[PDB]
């Protein structure tokens, strides 16, 4: 590529597109922790007996 | 799951004008080529040079 | 021991298969080109005792007899192959597929797997590769001094060099289909291999006999649906609970006869 | 007393021993430069019974005889040496590690210890110090009327004095890099001493050979990821449980056993 003096190349990180996919993130994450919950309140179950 | 891997999205990015005679932008394809004190070889897309 | 405590034994190992599947699925909620799975079971041993139908009397028969079952089994799970939702990442190394095809990627032991992820990257000496470094296949490789990258609906490669106003056409990638697709045996990272029960590889092309269609600058997304997931584990754990719960019955009432 | 209890007292000790890693990296989370542990365990003896591979008949040999074996014991906590986050504190006398080398301090007993450690203060006689006093080899003495404090990347420690144009030099921070990192004895107060496993102490200069830079103004937080350590608590509590209820089962089969 050519050299262009006097201009600086900015990052590409668009907000927008960050920001969807940190709530889409925490939304999997939550899932995750939710069937961990779940395997143990069977386990719990399990030693109850 | 297994994380595959990390990549980084090499994509033009935006240019924008400083004022500065010692500034370079880099359009398309290309890398500055660094030596650091130990004689290394390094390379890097800013352009930010004093 | 007992025949409740053995019944009762399988209930709570199918409902842990079924706790297992719906937790790998949700952990992979993300990966690309991912199908999902689905556990399905069968009955079990049905002891026959007073057989159903007997003849018991010289002219009168006996309506379903004394059947008493053993437990569940599962016969397998499922790959539930469908298409998932494209996504627009804006990369020309990223292709999807919008069919039931698959890409064909040749293993290190001379084997080859088939995959329907898209997260295509170049290696050093110039070849496609998966994400994992295993070489696409037929071959599709890529001179250094490439400006852009250009993969075509029908999966033909091409490159622009400097200065050339005509694009140079550098493979053409083609998609595998198979007759069924769930026999597939899955090896990991995104590979699958083929299996008796899933035919043969038929290759073909992109927009013929029935390969499908391929969007470059795109990613398959999983089709795991993260709802669906919530409520079979609410009600895998309360199956699970109540098949625990028979078993402490049994458990209570082997207690008092020994007590006896 | 009875073989499986014995089993079953060896898993609660080695549960307890792993919670108390877990405690352990709990508490140092706001520690600068440390590693947390984690601990192995190794399954224990065998009691032999039948010979498995023992010939039975003339030509018939015996697979997998009658190998019971005993509880668990943990062989080793080790270290993870990962490059924990950096935290700007804006300070002239923090410093910070970028690779995998130690700093060199003087206890007073006269032997050496090595820390991660950056959080270096003054003493009353102007020399470097570590914040529980320890005196920070290879030396640097800062002078009174000091203006500034500018350690560089390489470990050269300079003083602005007033009334001079040019910075004076008052020493050279070196590291010290072992060939096994983990082989460490950890003393307490952040510091590890050399032990046999631990090679010998190879010192060098920030930048040369493998030794990390030295970042000022920047200190290095504890490697400790929580989440990881919530979810292992979880599995511990489960298992601690599990092995307890081994436990009442063992002395339920005993008390049965005495009324006979």
Redesign the interface.
């Known amino acids: ?12 990180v668009d907000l927008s597109k960050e920001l969807v996919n940190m709530i889409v ?1 925490q ?2 994450y939550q ?2 922790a ?3 919950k ?10 109850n ?1 | 799951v297994k994380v595959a891997g990390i990549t980084q ?1 090499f ?11 010692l ?8 890398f500055f080529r660094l030596v650091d004190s130990n004689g290394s070889v390094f390379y890097s ?4 040079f004093k | 021991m007992i025949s409740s405590l053995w019944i009762a034994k399988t209930g ?1 190992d199918a409902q ?1 298969t079924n ?1 297992d599947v ?2 790998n699925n ?2 992979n ?2 990966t690309n080109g991912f199908k999902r799975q689905r556990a399905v079971f069968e009955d079990l041993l049905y002891q026959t005792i007073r057989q159903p139908g007997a003849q018991s009397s010289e002219q009168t028969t006996l309506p379903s007899g004394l059947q008493i079952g053993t437990g569940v089994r599962p016969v397998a799970t499922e790959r539930l192959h469908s298409q998932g939702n494209l996504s627009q990442t804006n990369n020309s190394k990223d292709v999807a597929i919008k069919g039931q095809g698959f890409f064909q990627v040749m293993l290190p032991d001379g084997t080859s797997a088939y995959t329907r992820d898209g997260s295509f990257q170049v290696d050093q000496n110039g070849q496609l590769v998966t994400a994992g470094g295993f070489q696409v296949q037929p071959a599709i490789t890529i001179p250094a001094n490439a400006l852009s990258i250009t993969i075509g609906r029908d999966g033909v490669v091409s490159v622009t060099q400097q200065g050339q106003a005509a694009p140079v056409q550098v493979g053409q990638l083609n998609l595998t289909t198979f007759m069924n697709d769930t026999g597939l045996e899955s090896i990991g990272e995104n590979l699958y291999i083929e299996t008796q029960s899933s035919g043969a590889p038929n290759e073909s092309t992109p927009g013929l006999n029935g390969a499908g269609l391929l969007y470059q600058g795109y990613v398959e997304t999983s089709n795991v649906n ?1 709802a669906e ?2 409520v079979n ?1 609410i009600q ?2 309360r199956a ?2 109540i098949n ?1 719960k028979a ?2 019955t049994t ?1 209570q009432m082997l207690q008092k006869l020994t007590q006896l």
Do not use: H, W
């Not at chain 1, 779940?38 to 030693?47: A, E, F, Y």
């Not at chain 2, 500034?23 to 290309?30: L, P, R, T, W």
């Open positions: 590529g050519k050299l262009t003096n006097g201009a600086l190349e900015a990052s590409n993130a939304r999997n899932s995750n939710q069937t961990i779940t395997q143990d309140q069977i386990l719990n179950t399990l030693v007996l | 999205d994509t033009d990015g935006t240019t924008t004008n400083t004022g500065r005679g500034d370079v932008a880099i359009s398309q394809n290309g897309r800013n352009g930010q | 709570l842990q706790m719906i937790a949700l952990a909620v993300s993260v997931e919530l584990m895998v754990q699970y609970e625990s078993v402490s458990d």
